[PDB]
């Protein structure tokens, strides 16, 4: 519970760390749809999510358990898979960071 949330915080720190920065960077901050010219993004994605939002939520004790934390991290990846064609560069980066996430999440106490 507290212990599972510590494991989740460890995962989050790893996802934001230099080790994974070459492919994690698209997930660091909310998608700025206007700035990127993605004028359909918010018609297609109902629930935006990104790692800075997950971090704020963890810091504020929003997540009561691991499952709630994981749902947001997975939501972030699902948004990427929903919006972008499956052969897009950002999707290749998502698959790698998602693999990092799932393998360490599976080691939950």
Swiss-Prot record:
Domain Bromo: 1-108
Membrane spanning residue stretches: none
Superkingdom as given in the UniProt entry: Eukaryota
Subcellular location: Nucleus; Chromosome
Quaternary organization: Homodimer. Interacts with E2F1. Interacts with (acetylated) STAT3; promoting STAT3 recruitment to chromatin. Interacts with CTCF; promoting BRD2 recruitment to chromatin. (Microbial infection) Interacts with herpes virus 8 protein LANA1.
Misc. comment: Some specific inhibitors of BRD2 that prevent binding to acetylated histone are promising therapeutic molecules for the treatment of cancers or inflammatory diseases. ABBV-744, a small molecule, has been tested on tumors with success: ABBV-744 antiproliferative activity is mainly restricted to cell lines of acute myeloid leukaemia and prostate cancer and is able to displace BRD4 from chromatin. GSK046 (iBET-BD2), which specifically inhibits the second bromo domain, is a promising therapeutic small molecule for the treatment of inflammatory and autoimmune diseases.
Free-text note on domains in this protein's UniProt record: The first bromo domain specifically recognizes histone H4 acetylated at 'Lys-12' (H4K12ac). It also specifically binds histone H4 acetyl-methylated at 'Lys-5' and 'Lys-12' (H4K5acme and H4K12acme, respectively). The second bromo domain recognizes and binds histone H4 acetylated at 'Lys-5' and 'Lys-12' (H4K5ac and H4K12ac, respectively).
UniProt record similarity statement: Belongs to the BET family.
Function: Chromatin reader protein that specifically recognizes and binds histone H4 acetylated at 'Lys-5' and 'Lys-12' (H4K5ac and H4K12ac, respectively), thereby controlling gene expression and remodeling chromatin structures. Recruits transcription factors and coactivators to target gene sites, and activates RNA polymerase II machinery for transcriptional elongation.
Entry protein name: Bromodomain-containing protein 2
Originating species: Homo sapiens (Human)
Lineage, top ranks: Eukaryota, Metazoa, Chordata, Craniata, Vertebrata
């Amino acid at each position: 519970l507290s212990e599972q949330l510590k494991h989740c915080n460890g995962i989050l720190k790893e996802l934001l760390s230099k080790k994974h920065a070459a492919y994690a960077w698209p997930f660091y901050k909310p998608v700025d749809a206007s700035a990127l010219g993605l004028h359909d993004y918010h018609d297609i994605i109902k629930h935006p999510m990104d790692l800075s939002t997950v971090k704020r939520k963890m810091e504020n004790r929003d997540y009561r358990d691991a499952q709630e934390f994981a749902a947001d991290v997975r939501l972030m990846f699902s948004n990427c898979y929903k919006y972008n064609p499956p052969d897009h560069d950002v999707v290749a980066m998502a698959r790698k960071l998602h693999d990092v996430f799932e393998f360490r999440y599976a080691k939950m106490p």
